């Protein structure tokens, strides 16, 4: 019940939309995806570091909105995450973060991943984080197709998560999926 | 202040429980790299830009810890921009070399960045290699990365003093191509940057494929 | 000494002769068995007629040499041209006070109107020794006898050039960490003269 | 040291073993592994030697200072967040020490019981039931727990868990002290586990 | 064995249209000391095979003894020992690879890397590699040690696939081998300027060249 | 102490059809980040319509294949040239692997052929002889990429029982092309051996060489 | 004439070494509540298991400055380091901004860091005693 | 190699000249820094005109030399005087077949009517090399250059004596493990001649 | 410090009726290599003190700098700095021993063994020893390193007790020191034939002899 | 594994815990750590895994062979000497293994009970009482033992020792099987300890 370390995060890009999904534990709270207005961050790894990073980024994004008088864009948030991670060069957090979002002015979807000291990997297709399943990357590679509609993208990412969960730990596995458009965000739960 | 040492003991307790070339030619310098980015044996990105810009006419490419390379390059670029504004003069490659050398020596090799730096300034064209511990060296042609041996073989095969711009570009492209073919770390594309005296820098993304 | 650090497996010579001093070295820098640079220049200038060669850690010796050059510029702004003894003393102080953290050895060759050419050696540890001639590096061990049999005081310039060329050719022949061209600097009252000799010349000696 | 906690519909029940130090024979009648943070928030702790007691007393002092300063009581959620922050801070420059805390409270603004668990690295999890120190009581809790259980049913489940624990421990296990936090405050069950 | 003491650096080889070419330097090193000059590391076996050996020199001499004994035992009570019952490159390689794997399995290995080159009786080219672990493989170009990292990229530009073999003359292959040896002398600290080369051709037989030196060295840009 | 083991990472895949079997492998032989060769086959015809591959440390796999083929020669000599069945070959290979229990071969072994009823059969072995019959198995560096591709393409989606030889060959080629695009150690070439009642047929395809 | 900082280890310890957080009930013991370090941090734990580069990084600039002062003393005389130290002391002494942590412009001019940036500049960085009055007491020594 | 075992930090030379061969050595045996024996004789006779010098473990080399002398007596009982090549082959076989358990290096100098004086060196490991001249020991490293500059083929007896004396004097001068007197054996068609030179003679060269 | 690199071997010394004698060789070794010849290891302080140092050469030069600075600071503004306020051997030894113990306590020691010899202003002989651990002691004969194991037995046969001091002339003590140096040159592999000697006498002052060589060496019985 | 033994005036009482290996749950009713060497000599053993059982079965086979060959029974002293010799021999060329044996017998030539203890190195000591496997029963034995105690008093002392052992062990300690060797042979106390 108190063991929540680990997990997986999958981010994918469609046509004028993005999808970010994470695994969720069983029933009888701790979700690994957070948002800062219209930028979504999913963190895998040590749970205490995940909570610390979420609190720090909420702090920084609130101050940024108060000063700039506008919400922060995915690229700027990516750079901020990179610099914050690099600050702890010799004591780094045991985390793998993934960022997804849509730029307001341009409408271009954006996803990125980070290493534990902030090296940025900007991918045009998808990002997978976590070490729960080794075949999850292969399943995402086999299922992904460029320029998918939000319904098709949701189906693809949900199928990838379900297939990864089937050949892995079971009896309580759940998923949380976010479909992000320029003006609409949909959050869904998968109990399969 | 500075880089933090917090959670060092905690991390210890938890633990207890690329081809880059640079070529000089008669009126400038050329730097070239491959575009394959890997995370272990997995190809993370088939089109990655490894050529970085310290200043409009001073470029570099690195190996080692990627985050360290990027951070050090950006810090030195900020220092170079401020110094150029302060002196109202074009930045010199020697100044960037001095800043990089002293910064790397301060950290006693704990910043894992190995660099090739090429540039053009009012004093001429310059090419340097920089080691993580702070040692620097000068040369007419340099190679770096896991594919550096094949690229160096190609460079030693077809290098001469009187090289034109086109010959230098072809030689750098061939060295990167050899690293691409014979090294598992490289393979996708070739990025080039040509810095010629008296002209703007020319950045060629995906020069070959 | 540091893990994964560039070392200086060189061949260094400095000989005092009738008109001044000559400093000579090879041009090979290696990483293990791979030759990282075959045309490196190892003759470091810290003042117009005060030059040195370095051994040990490359980064530590480069930092020490830069500090020494800065110190000599400060001294020159006050009292004019420094003596070779002053530069050797500064090198010795920097090497000795940091011997627990830095690995450095320095051969210093200088000329001035008062002393008329001098050689100093500062091996690892930080001690200083003044000698009529000095050898250092991994390849020096193979020419200890030959030099002892062929050095004379007050040799002419050409004889000193030949002696250094022969000794460094043997050092290159027997040491795997030494090779390339032979570079020399001649410091006299007339000025500074740079010389280079290629393998096809000295390998036939 | 073993600690257990169950959040039932209207209260939180915390059970702590009244153990003594090893190598010295002690006779006493006090619960040394529990500090009252606030009149409606209790904390039980387990782990190594006096580091844990120092941390618990430091937390209690800070919370009492807040209560005096504001003439107000922090909610259990805020108390747990502060404890998590302090625990994360305490090991930023030293080797981590074994510690595990259960925080049980009754929020009067929301009028509901709450239970949190924080491990030695500073991971806070909100749970309906929890335990620490046991080498399986988890299955017994899973099969016999319901969200709308009364205090008596929670006490019966706690007694079953205590019996299961004691069936595989020597007679040196003297017993477990049980406390209940609800809308009337914190009380001690002097009768039995 | 269990540690190398006196060693040789690298051997390189390639196939051309009508035969094979192999080459190796003449140095035996003693650590950083370039102790022995004049060590022959290409061993001609029969009129059709050449064996190049890199690594421990004492083990190399042991292998030379084994090869000589194999040649002698082939001719034991054999009238046509040189006409139709002469040793083939494949036979020699099979024996050597068996020995290498057996001594690996005994935890008593021979610290060498071996390349066998030659022409079979039917005119086919033979070029194969074995090492101290018993790992064997074949390729149109082969090299050991530092050469494997620098000579192979240069040689694969001439012969990159099987279909390139019929298009490669002896002159082009020999020039490529010479250039690769020059590059190795440039960038290998345990290398020598003196080397030996061997050409095995299905028409002209075996040509063994000794006392070859690296020439045309660009030591001119170091003046500035 | 001297380390007697090495690694020459490659990828193999065995699939059992209705009345055929296929065993495929990449032809790349590498050491660390260097390329030893671009065409070094690892799938061999062992006689009696049995194909074998031992992926991992190349010397150990070569020794195992050599020993198995010599044992097959003696089996033919001692039993009136009787045909060796696939299950008997699997038992022999289990004994050969377990004979090195305290000094094991550092390989993973796949064999393929036709059973007594004519159906395709594939057997997979652990390094010390534990073996099982399987419909499909991938081994090596890129197995975790090849298996999801086949699982998405086929149902064990047209069922595997009704697939023809050409369709299986196409599926293997596509999976290996994808793995070559994603994995640095996979490329150069792919070789497939097909076992049917008429015998063993070899096919070769080129892969990306970077 | 030091390059790498030396003599960084502590030679003596005591329970009252940190004079600013001494307990008022027991003046020989520290006040753990006002330390605000988590309440479970003995001083002895700070003597072991430190990162070897931390002391080098923390004292690097001071070491370089001391070497520069020693060079000035050797070459120019006592007056030059005396004047540099006097200027730095005067600038640092009259600056008191309890609501800010950034250094002064004049200090950067004196340190020749007008157009220089290091990681200390990029990354310059409670319940009890983090107010203006604590800084006033520390500054005035009362 | 064995813990607490006597090592051979010597200076060994063997030179072929017009009339035959000359083998020379120093006379110092040390245990760490203490000199255990300053007048030791290092010229080992395995046959009337076949002599050797040893390096590495003293016990292993002594055992190997005794076995070789016994082998050569057996050979002489059958076929007469053995050649230097045969003795070198026996030494090589003994050193190579036992290289995992014994640490031994041998320099062999011989004379016979057919080959007229030969030198063989068997360094650690067991390989064999035939050379016009050979040097070995801890003090040989300091005279690699000098010998390479001063050896000529077909020198007279006196010139060879002088060359060996100078080289060994330098080796003694620079090596702490070498010292004492210089002992030489001259093997020609005339017979065997033993020579000794004292420090007061060769230190003034 | 924390490792010696360039070192000197040994210093020997004894008392006689009217003064003290000390001696040391002129070699700086670099391991097994006898690198530097011409290193002076006897440092005369004032007109009445001699300090002999064995061990690390760089630390020895540091100690020489300290001694020179001590002399300069004693001189300073003192008018009678050479008549009645000159430095005594006891003062120099006390300072040096304090330094040695303090640097031992800092885990940053000076890798040397030091002997101070001289004559006090009242005519008394002074001869004392300190080392890198701060251990100090006095004896009528003193030696460091190998000398402590070989020179002391020879010197104690001449001066075995305090009562033997008045019976020992300068000639006998000097001959004993010379013979001890010859024995050390015989049996020490890091020793040199060249050495320096110093006599401090309450009547004749300081006599410093350089360029002394071991003579009368019995290299004659090695012929057979 | 814990073994105990008391030699009373006319017999020897040996008690062995009916324990089981770790990691596997077993339901059995037998004394697996005791072998009958002869109709008047019994051996109880404790220690590590099957090495001890192999040694005990080897000893039993040798003694049965002697009894068949001579048509006679060895005395307990000779049996203990042979066991000591074999135990010393078994570790002359291998790493020693943990083993401890109690040999209890009734000599009919002398008509008296005898008890011996041999440790893992092969040290044989003749004792009135002994034990192995207990981390104190020594004081209880010293205070309440007399040479002329009857069988009933020895059983009472054994029961007191068993109670003392069980007061500091979990309920996983199922019980102790007790056997008595006297002039009528070897019998099992089926009632209790």
Swiss-Prot record, chain A:
**Species, as recorded:** Saccharomyces cerevisiae (strain ATCC 204508 / S288c)
Quaternary structure per UniProt?
Answer: The 26S proteasome consists of a 20S proteasome core and two 19S regulatory subunits. The 20S proteasome core is composed of 28 subunits that are arranged in four stacked rings, resulting in a barrel-shaped structure. The two end rings are each formed by seven alpha subunits, and the two central rings are each formed by seven beta subunits. The catalytic chamber with the active sites is on the inside of the barrel.
Q: Do you know which PANTHER family this protein is assigned to?
A: METALLOPROTEASE TLDD, PROTEASOME SUBUNIT BETA TYPE-3
For this entry, list what GO says about its biological process: proteasomal ubiquitin-independent protein catabolic process; proteasome-mediated ubiquitin-dependent protein catabolic process
Query: Membrane-spanning regions, if any?
Result: none
Say which family it is in. Belongs to the peptidase T1B family.
Q: What is this protein called?
A: Proteasome subunit beta type-3
UniProt KW Ubl conjugation keyword: yes
Q: Which InterPro entries match?
A: Ntn_hydrolases_N (IPR029055), Proteasome_beta_3 (IPR033811), Proteasome_bsu_CS (IPR016050), Proteasome_sua/b (IPR001353), Proteasome_suB-type (IPR023333)
Which residues constitute the signal peptide according to the record? none
- Can you locate the Glycyl lysine isopeptide (Lys-Gly) (interchain with G-Cter in ubiquitin) cross-link? 60
GO CC, sorted alphabetically, is: cytosol; nucleus; proteasome complex; proteasome core complex, beta-subunit complex
Q: Which SUPFAM superfamilies match?
A: N-terminal nucleophile aminohydrolases (Ntn hydrolases)
Q: Record keywords: Nucleus included?
A: yes
Alphabetized UniProt keyword annotations? Cytoplasm, Isopeptide bond, Nucleus, Phosphoprotein, Proteasome, Ubl conjugation
Q: Which CDD domains match?
A: proteasome_beta_type_3
Tell me which residues bear Phosphoserine. Answer: 28
From Swiss-Prot, chains C, H:
Q: Which GO terms describe its cellular component?
A: cytosol; nucleus; proteasome complex; proteasome core complex, beta-subunit complex; proteasome storage granule
Q: Name one GO biological process term.
A: proteasome-mediated ubiquitin-dependent protein catabolic process
Active-site positions on this chain: 10
According to the lineage, what is the superkingdom? Eukaryota
One example GO MF annotation: endopeptidase activity
Catalytic reactions of this protein: Cleavage of peptide bonds with very broad specificity
Q: Which UniProt keywords apply?
A: Acetylation, Cytoplasm, Hydrolase, Nucleus, Protease, Proteasome, Threonine protease, Zymogen
Question: What protein family is recorded?
Answer: Belongs to the peptidase T1B family.
Other facts noted in the record for this chain = The side chain of Thr-10 acts as a nucleophile, and the N-terminal amino group acts as a proton acceptor.
Record-given protein name: Proteasome subunit beta type-1
* Species whose genome carries this gene: Saccharomyces cerevisiae (strain ATCC 204508 / S288c)
Curated annotation (Swiss-Prot), chain F:
Coiled-coil intervals: none
Q: What's the domain of life for this entry?
A: Eukaryota
Q: Keywords, A to Z?
A: Cytoplasm, Nucleus, Proteasome
- One Pfam family assigned to this protein is Proteasome
> InterPro entries of this UniProt entry?
Ntn_hydrolases_N (IPR029055), Proteasome_bsu_CS (IPR016050), Proteasome_sua/b (IPR001353), Proteasome_suB-type (IPR023333)
Protein purpose: Non-catalytic component of the proteasome which degrades poly-ubiquitinated proteins in the cytoplasm and in the nucleus. It is essential for the regulated turnover of proteins and for the removal of misfolded proteins. The proteasome is a multicatalytic proteinase complex that is characterized by its ability to cleave peptides with Arg, Phe, Tyr, Leu, and Glu adjacent to the leaving group at neutral or slightly basic pH. It has an ATP-dependent proteolytic activity.
Which family is this protein grouped under?
Belongs to the peptidase T1B family.
Please give the name of this protein. Proteasome subunit beta type-6
Q: Which organism is it from?
A: Saccharomyces cerevisiae (strain ATCC 204508 / S288c) (Baker's yeast)
UniProtKB/Swiss-Prot annotation, chain G:
Top-rank taxon, per record: Eukaryota
Q: Where is the composition biased (Polar residues)?
A: 8-26
Provide the alphabetized UniProt keywords. Chaperone
Point out the coiled-coil segments of this chain: none
What processing steps or modifications follow its translation? Seems to be degraded by the proteasome upon its formation.
Q: What is a single Pfam family found in this protein's UniProt entry?
A: UMP1
A GO BP annotation:
ubiquitin-dependent protein catabolic process
Q: What role does it play?
A: Short-lived chaperone present in the precursor form of the 20S proteasome and absent in the mature complex. Required for the correct assembly and enzymatic activation of the proteasome. Also prevents premature processing of the PRE2 propeptide.
Similarity annotation: Belongs to the POMP/UMP1 family.
Additional info? Present with 2740 molecules/cell in log phase SD medium.
Name by which UniProt lists this protein? Proteasome maturation factor UMP1
* Gene name of the encoded protein: UMP1
């Amino acid at each position: 019940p108190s063991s929540i370390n680990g997990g997986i995060v999958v981010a994918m890009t469609g046509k004028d939309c993005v999808a970010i999904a994470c695994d969720l534990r069983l029933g009888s709270k701790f979700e690994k995806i957070f948002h800062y207005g219209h930028v979504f961050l999913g963190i895998t790894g040590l749970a205490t570091d995940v909570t610390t990073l979420n609190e720090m980024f909420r702090y920084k994004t609130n101050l940024y909105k108060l000063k700039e008088e506008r919400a922060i864009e995915p690229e700027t948030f990516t750079q901020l995450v990179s610099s914050s991670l690099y600050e702890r060069r010799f004591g780094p957090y045991f985390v793998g973060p993934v960022v997804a979002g849509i730029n307001s002015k341009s409408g271009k979807p954006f996803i990125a991943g980070f290493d534990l000291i902030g090296c940025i990997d900007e991918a045009k297709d998808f990002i997978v984080s976590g070490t729960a399943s080794d075949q999850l990357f292969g399943m995402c590679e086999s299922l992904y197709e460029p320029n998918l509609e939000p319904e098709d993208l949701f189906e693809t990412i949900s199928q990838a998560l379900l297939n990864a969960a089937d050949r892995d730990a079971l009896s309580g596995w759940g998923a949380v999926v976010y479909i992000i458009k320029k003006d609409e965000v949909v959050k869904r739960y998968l109990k399969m | 202040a500075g880089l933090s040492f917090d959670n060092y003991q905690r991390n210890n307790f938890l633990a207890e429980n690329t081809t880059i070339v640079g070529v000089k030619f008669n009126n400038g310098v050329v730097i070239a790299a491959d575009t394959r980015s890997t995370q272990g044996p997995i190809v993370a990105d088939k089109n990655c830009a490894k050529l970085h810009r310290i200043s409009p006419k001073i470029w570099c490419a690195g190996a080692g810890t990627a985050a360290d390379t990027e951070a050090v390059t950006q810090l030195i670029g900020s220092n170079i921009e401020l110094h150029s504004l302060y002196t109202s003069r074009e930045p010199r490659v020697v100044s960037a070399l001095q800043m990089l050398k002293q910064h790397l020596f301060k950290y006693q090799g704990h910043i894992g960045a190995y660099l090739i730096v090429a540039g053009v300034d009012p004093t001429g064209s310059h090419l340097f290699s920089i080691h993580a511990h702070g040692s620097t060296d000068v040369g007419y042609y340099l190679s770096l990365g896991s594919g550096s041996l094949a690229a160096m073989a190609v460079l030693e095969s077809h290098w001469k003093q009187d090289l034109t711009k086109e010959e230098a570009i072809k030689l750098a492209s061939d060295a990167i191509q050899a690293g691409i073919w014979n090294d598992l770390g490289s393979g996708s594309n070739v990025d080039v940057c040509v810095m010629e005296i008296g002209k703007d820098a020319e950045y060629l993304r995906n020069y070959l494929t | 000494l540091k893990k994964g650090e560039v070392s200086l497996g060189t061949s260094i010579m400095a000989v005092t002769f009738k008109d001044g001093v000559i400093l000579g070295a090879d041009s090979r820098t290696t990483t293990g068995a791979y030759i990282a640079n075959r045309v490196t220049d190892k003759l470091t200038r810290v003042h117009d007629k005060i030059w040195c060669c370095r051994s040990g850690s490359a980064a530590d010796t480069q930092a020490i040499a830069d500090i020494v050059q800065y110190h000599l510029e400060l001294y020159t702004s006050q009292y004019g041209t420094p003596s070779t003894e002053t530069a050797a003393s500064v090198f010795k102080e920097l090497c000795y006070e940091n011997k627990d953290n830095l690995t450095a050895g320095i051969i210093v060759a200088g000329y001035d109107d008062k002393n008329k050419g001098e050689v100093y050696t500062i091996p690892l540890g930080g001690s200083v020794h003044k000698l009529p001639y000095a050898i250092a590096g991994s390849g020096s061990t193979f020419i200890y006898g030959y030099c002892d049999k062929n050095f004379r005081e007050n040799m002419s310039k050409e004889e000193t050039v030949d002696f250094i060329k022969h000794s460094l050719s043997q050092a290159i022949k027997w040491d795997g960490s030494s090779g390339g061209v032979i570079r020399m600097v001649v410091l006299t009252a007339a000025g500074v003269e740079r010389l280079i000799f290629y393998p096809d010349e000295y390998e036939q000696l | 040291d073993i600690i257990l906690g169950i959040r039932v519909q209207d209260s939180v029940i915390l059970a702590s073993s009244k153990a003594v130090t090893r190598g010295i024979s002690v006779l006493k009648d006090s619960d040394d592994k529990t500090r009252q943070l606030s009149p409606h928030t209790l904390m039980s702790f387990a782990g190594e030697a006096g580091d844990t007691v120092q941390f618990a007393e430091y937390i209690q002092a800070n919370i009492q200072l807040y209560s005096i300063r504001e003439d107000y009581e922090l909610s259990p959620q805020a108390v747990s967040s502060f404890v998590r922050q302090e625990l994360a801070k305490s090991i930023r420059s030293r080797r981590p020490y074994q510690v595990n805390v259960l925080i049980g409270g009754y929020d009067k603004k929301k009028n509901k019981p709450e239970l949190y668990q924080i491990d030695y690295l500073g991971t806070k999890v909100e749970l309906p039931y929890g335990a620490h120190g046991y080498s399986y009581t988890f299955f017994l809790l899973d099969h016999h727990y319901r969200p709308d259980m009364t205090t008596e049913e929670g006490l019966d489940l706690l007694k079953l868990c205590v019996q299961e624990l004691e069936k595989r421990m020597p007679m040196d296990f003297k017993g477990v002290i049980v406390k209940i936090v609800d809308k009337d405050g914190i009380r001690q069950v002097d009768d039995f586990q | 064995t269990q540690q190398p003491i006196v060693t040789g650096t690298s051997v390189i080889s390639m196939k051309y249209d009508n035969g094979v070419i192999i080459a190796a330097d003449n140095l035996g090193s003693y650590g950083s000391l370039l102790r022995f000059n004049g060590v022959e590391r290409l061993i001609p076996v029969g009129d059709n095979t050449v064996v190049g050996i890199s690594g421990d020199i004492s083990d190399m001499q042991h292998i030379e003894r084994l090869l000589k004994d194999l040649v002698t035992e082939n001719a034991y009570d054999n009238p046509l020992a040189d006409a139709e019952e002469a040793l083939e490159p494949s036979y020699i390689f099979e024996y050597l690879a068996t020995v290498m794997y057996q001594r690996r399995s005994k935890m008593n290995p021979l610290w060498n890397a071996i390349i066998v080159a030659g022409v079979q009786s039917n005119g086919d080219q033979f070029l194969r590699y074995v090492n101290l672990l018993g790992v064997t493989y074949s390729s149109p170009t082969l090299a050991t040690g530092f050469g494997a990292h620098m000579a192979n990229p240069l040689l694969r530009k001439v012969v990159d696939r099987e279909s390139d073999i019929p298009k490669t003359t002896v002159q082009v292959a020999e020039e490529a081998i010479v250039n690769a040896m020059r590059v190795l002398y440039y960038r290998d600290a345990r290398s020598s300027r003196n080397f030996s080369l061997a050409i095995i051709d299905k028409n002209t037989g075996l040509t063994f060249k000794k006392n070859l030196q690296v020439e045309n060295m660009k030591w001119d840009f170091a003046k500035d | 102490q001297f380390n007697p083991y090495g690694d020459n990472g490659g990828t193999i895949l065995g699939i059992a059809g209705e009345d055929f079997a296929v065993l495929a492998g990449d032809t790349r032989n590498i050491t660390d980040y260097s390329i030893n060769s671009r065409y070094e086959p690892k799938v061999f015809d062992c006689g009696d319509n049995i194909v074998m591959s031992a992926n991992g440390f190349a010397a150990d796999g070569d020794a195992l294949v050599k020993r198995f083929k010599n044992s097959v020669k003696w089996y033919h000599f001692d039993h009136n040239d009787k045909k060796l069945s696939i299950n008997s070959a699997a038992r022999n290979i289990q004994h050969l692997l377990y004979g090195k229990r305290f000094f094991p071969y550092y390989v993973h072994t796949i064999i393929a052929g036709l059973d007594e009823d004519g159906k395709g059969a594939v057997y997979s072995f652990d390094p010390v002889g534990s073996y099982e019959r399987e419909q499909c198995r991938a081994g090596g560096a890129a197995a975790s990429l090849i298996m999801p591709f086949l699982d998405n393409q086929v149902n064990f989606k047209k069922p595997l029982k009704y697939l023809s030889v050409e369709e299986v060959i196409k599926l293997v080629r596509d999976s290996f092309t994808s793995a070559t695009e994603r994995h640095i150690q996979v490329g150069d070439g792919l070789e497939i051996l097909i076992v049917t009642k008429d015998g063993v047929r070899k096919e070769f395809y080129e892969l990306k060489r970077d | 004439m030091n390059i790498v900082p030396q003599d960084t280890f502590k030679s003596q310890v005591s329970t009252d070494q940190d004079k600013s957080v001494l307990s008022s009930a027991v003046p020989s013991l520290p006040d753990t509540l006002r330390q605000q370090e988590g309440g479970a941090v003995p001083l002895s734990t700070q003597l072991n298991d430190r990162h070897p580069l931390e002391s080098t990084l923390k004292n690097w600039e001071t070491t370089q400055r001391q070497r520069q002062m020693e060079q000035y003393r050797q070459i120019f005389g006592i007056a030059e380091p005396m004047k540099r130290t006097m200027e730095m002391e005067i600038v640092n002494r009259t600056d008191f901004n309890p609501l800010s942590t950034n250094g002064s412009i004049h200090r950067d001019i004196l340190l020749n860091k007008e157009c220089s940036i290091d990681w200390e500049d990029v990354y310059p960085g409670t319940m009890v005693g983090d107010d203006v009055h604590s800084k006033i007491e520390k500054q005035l020594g009362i």
